[PDB]
Amino acid sequence: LKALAMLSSDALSSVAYGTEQILIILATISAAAFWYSIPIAVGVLILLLALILSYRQIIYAYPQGGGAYIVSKENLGEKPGLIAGGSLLVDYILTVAVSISAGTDAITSAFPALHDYHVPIAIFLVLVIMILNLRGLSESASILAYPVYLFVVALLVLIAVGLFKLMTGQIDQPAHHTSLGTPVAGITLFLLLKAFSSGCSALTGVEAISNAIPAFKNPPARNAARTLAMMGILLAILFSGITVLAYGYGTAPKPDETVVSQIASETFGRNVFYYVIQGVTSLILVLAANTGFSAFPQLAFNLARDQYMPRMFTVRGDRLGFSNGIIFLGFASIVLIILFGGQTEHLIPLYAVGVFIPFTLSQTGMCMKWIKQKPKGWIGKMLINSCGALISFMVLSILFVTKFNVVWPVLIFMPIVVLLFFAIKNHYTAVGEQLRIVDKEPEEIKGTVVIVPGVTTVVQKSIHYAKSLSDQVIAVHVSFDREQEKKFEKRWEELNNGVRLVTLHLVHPFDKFLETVEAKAKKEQFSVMVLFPQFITKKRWHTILHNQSAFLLRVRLFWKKDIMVATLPYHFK
Amino acid sequence: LKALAMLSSDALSSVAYGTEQILIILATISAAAFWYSIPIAVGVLILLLALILSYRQIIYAYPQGGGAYIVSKENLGEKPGLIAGGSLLVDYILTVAVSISAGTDAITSAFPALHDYHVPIAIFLVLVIMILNLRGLSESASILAYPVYLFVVALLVLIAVGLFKLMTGQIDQPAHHTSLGTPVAGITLFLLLKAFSSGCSALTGVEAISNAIPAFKNPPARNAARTLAMMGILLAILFSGITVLAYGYGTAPKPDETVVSQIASETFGRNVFYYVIQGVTSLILVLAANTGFSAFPQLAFNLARDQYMPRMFTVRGDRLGFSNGIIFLGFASIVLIILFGGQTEHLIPLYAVGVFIPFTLSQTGMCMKWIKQKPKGWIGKMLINSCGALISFMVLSILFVTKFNVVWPVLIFMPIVVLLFFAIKNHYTAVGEQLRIVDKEPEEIKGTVVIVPGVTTVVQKSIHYAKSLSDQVIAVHVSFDREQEKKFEKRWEELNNGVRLVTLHLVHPFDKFLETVEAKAKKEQFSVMVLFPQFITKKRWHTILHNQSAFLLRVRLFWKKDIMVATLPYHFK
Ligand SMILES: [K+]
Ligand SMILES: [K+]
Ligand SMILES: [K+]
Ligand SMILES: [K+]
Ligand SMILES: [K+]
Ligand SMILES: [K+]
User: Fold this and answer.
1) Residue from A121, A549, A563, A573 to probe the interface with B (highest B Cβ count within 10 Å)
2) Structural domain spans, chain B
3) How many contacts, defined by CB atoms under 8 Å, are there between A and B?
4) Which of B471, B474, B476 is nearest to B448 (CA)?
C-alpha cells in the first residue's frame, strides 16, 4: 500500500505533549490569562511551512537522501558536521525518553489511581519496546501501521464533535478569556518568544522523513516529497484543531492530566468514548519510541563509515551492533527518565535543543552548498534556507539562554561525544598506519605443544583430539584440599591413559606453570597452545552455570602471554 | 586491633529508619497521640535479648559458625532449609536497598533543596558502592572501621546533651503528651502488635555476626560471642536513647525528614554541630549497604556446594562470581528502589519479612536439633529457642497479614528462587548421570584441515601458523560490492602466497560453505578447525571497536556444527 506510518508515528504524535502542555504551562506561569495560543500556533505553523519546503529542497537535491548529517559534513567539514551526529544521538535518546514519558502521562489519566508510581510504568514501557525490538524483531506491516490511521481518524472525529459543541451558540465552559486584543500585564515580547520556543517542539518529526528515505520502490522525488507534504498538512490541521479546542474551553494545564484528556473529557463526557482516545494516544506515543529505536542504526551506519563509530555497524541491520545500539539507547533513555522523573515538562527543552542543533546545521550547510554554485533560482532557495536557519537558530538560543537548569546534560554530553569520535578516528588512523606493513616470515616453528586442563568423556575426547592434532601433549588439573591427586594420577594411568601428565599443588600456580613453559618455548623455537572444552546444551538457557568459571577466568588470564587458545564443543544430546 | 566494625555497621545502623520512623508513623496514623513508644521499645529490647542469647547458643554450638542456612538444611532437610537461602537472598537485596534509601533520606535533610530528586541519589550511591567494590576492591582497615566509631561516639554525645536538655527542668517542646496510663480511643491491641511488628526491624543486624564468623585469629567461642554481646548492648542503649529522646520532645514523623534529624535539630540548634550527625548517619547507612555486598558471597559459596547455585562460586572470592554476584545484587536493589521510590516506609516490611523468615527457620531447626538429643540443660535451651521461634513467627505473621499491598514481591519471588534451585540441582544430577561414563576411542582421525578467514601482517602470521600446525589449509574472505576479489586473489598470489584459496560471493554463504566442508568431513574421517585472529591493544580500553563483530557473530554461528575454533592474539606493541 503506502506505509507512511513508520515515520508519521514520530511526526504527528506531537499533538499531545509539546503543543499545549508546554506552551500553555509557560503562558499560565506568566499571568494565568492566556490568549496567545492562537498567534503562537500560527507562528509555529509558519515555521513548519518553512521547514517542510526546506526539506522538500533537501530531498529534491539528494535522491540518496541521507539527511541532517551527510549534508552537514560534506558542506561544512569535520569539526562541524560531526556535531550534527552528536545532536542526532541526543535527539534519538530524547525521542524515546519523551515519547515514553508522555505515553505514561497519557495512560495515568484514564486510570488515575496508579499515578502514584509512573516512573516505573515508563521503564516498563521502554523495556517492553526494547524487548519487542530485540527478540521479537517484528517490523511488521499491520501493528506498526494501523494505530496511526486509528489515531488520525480518532482525533479528527473528536475535533469535529468538539468544534460542533463549541459552535451552535452553546457555552461548555462559562469561564472564558477575551478574543481580540486585550493585553495582560506581566507579559513581554521576551516571554512571548519564550513560549514560541518552548512550544516549537510540536514540529520535531519531519527529521524522521528526512532521515529514513529509502525502501520506497518508486522514483525517489515527487513521491516521498508528497508523503512529507501530506504529513505536514495533517500535523498542521491536527495541532491547530487541538489548540483551537484548548482555547475554546478553559483547559488549564493541570499537573496531573494532559491537554487532550481535558479536551476529550469536557467534549464527550467522562467515560463513554474518552477511553479510546487515551488508549490510542498512549499507543501512538509508544510507536514514536519505536521509531526512535528504528532510526538509530541508519545514523550509526552513516557514521561507522569514515571511521567514527565502532566498526561493527557496517552490516546495516544484520545483527551486530543493532543489539548494542538498542541496549545503549534504552539505557540512556532510562537514565534520563530517572534524572527527570516521569515529568515531560523538563525534558522538552532538552529534546528541542537536541532536534534544533541538527536543523540549524542542516540549513547552514544547505546554504553554503547553494552559495557554492548559482544554478537554478539561486537567491530564492538561498533566502529560504537562510531564513529557516535564522528562525531555528533563534529558537535554539531562546531555549538555551533560559531553562539552563535543565539543559546542562547537552553542554556536558556533546563535547564527550565529539572528543570520543575524534579519538576513534585517530585510533583507526594509528592502526592503519602501524598495521598494514610488509614484513618477513617468522622462525617456521615446526613444533607445537598442546596443553589441556576428572577422567571424563569430554576430557578423554579433548585429549584424543590433542593427541591427534599434535604430540608431546600435557594434561594438567588443579589439585587441592586432599590426597586424591595421587589417586587421580593412579586411576588415570591404570584406567585409560598412557599420555604424559604433570600435576600441580585459582590463578597463581597456573600462571607460574605457564610462565615456566613459556620459558621452555623461545630459545627452543616451539610454540604453545592451550585447548579448552565447552559444554553446550539443547534448551539454550544453560549457557550460564556450566562453563563460565574456567573459560572466563583463564581467557582473562591468557592476555600478555602470546599463546593461542582453542575451544572444543561437546554439544549434549 | 578488634575490627568488629564491618559487622557492627550492619547491626547498629538501625537507629535511624526502622526504629522511630516506621513505629511512630504507625502510631500517629492510628490516633496522633502516641505514648506507646516506650513499651514497644522495651518489647523490642526483650526480643533482642532473646535473639542475642539464641545466637550465643548457635555460635557456641558451631565453631564452624555458618548460621541461618546450614543449621536449617541439616536439621530440616531439603524443601525447608532452602527457603532460608531464598530469604537470605531477599534479605541481602533489601539490606542494600533499605540502607541506601535511608541514607538518601538522611542526606536530603541536611541540604533539603535537593529533595525534589532523591531517587537518582540512591541509584548514584548504589552505583558508587558497586564500583568501589568492583574495581577498587578496598576491604581496608581504616575507611571501613573509623566511621562506626565516629557514629557511636556522635550519637552517644548527642544522647548525652539531649537528655541533659530534657533534664534540669526545662521544656524544649511545650506540646507534650501524658506519661503513665491515659489510653487513647482508636487504639487496639491488634494495632499495638502491628506497631511492634513494624518497629521490630531495628534488630535486623545480629544475622550479620551470625553469618560472618571467621577471620578472628583466636578461639572462636568466648570472643565472637562477647563481640556480639557488646554490639547487642550498644544497639540496646542507642535505640533506647533515640526513642526516649523522641518521646522526650514532640517529634512528629514529618514526611520530609527523619527522626534523628528532628532530635539533633531541636537539641543542638539548626546548623552548628547538626551537620556532622547527618553526615555520619549517611556514611553509616552507606557502610551498611557495603556489608550487604560483602556478605553475599559467603551465602553464595555455602549454596554453590551441594549443587544449588551456579558452580562458579566455589573459589570463595577469587573473582569468578563475585563480579556477577555484585552486579545482580546491585540490579535487584536498583529495581526495588525504582518500584518503591526513595521511600524507606514501604520497603521496611519487605526487609523485615526477608530477615524474619531466616530467624524463624533457624530457631525451628535449632529446636529440632535440641529435641534430637538431651545432652546438657535440655529443656531450658529448648524453651529459649522455641519461644524465640514463637515471637519471630508472630512478628512475621503480623507483617504478612497486613501490608499485603507491599509484600507481594516476596510471595512472587520466593517460589521462583526455590523452583530454580530445584532445577539446578536436577540439572547437575542429570549431567553427572549422563556424563561420567566409560566409552571407547573414536576414529583416530589422523588428518585435520585448518580454515582461516586483506593481505595483512596479522593475516600472514595466522596463515603461517596454519601452515605450521597442519596442511591442506584453506583461506577464505567474504567478497562483496566490487570486482576487486579477483584483484585480491591476484595480488595475494603474485605478492606473497602460494597456499590454496577458495573465495566466495554476512552469515548465509559462510554457513553454506561450512556445511559443504562438513559434508567433506564425515566419510573422509578428517576433522575441521577454524582459526581466528585477535587484535589486543595496550591501553585496555580498545577491547571494543576492534574485533567484536566477526568474533561474536561467527562464534554464535559455530554451535551445532562440531568444529573446534581457535584464537591467535597479535598484541599490538
Ligand atoms: K515522539
Ligand atoms: K527526530
Ligand atoms: K525520529
Ligand atoms: K542496614
Ligand atoms: K541481615
Ligand atoms: K547483613
Assistant:
1) A549
2) 1-439, 440-573
3) 145
4) B471
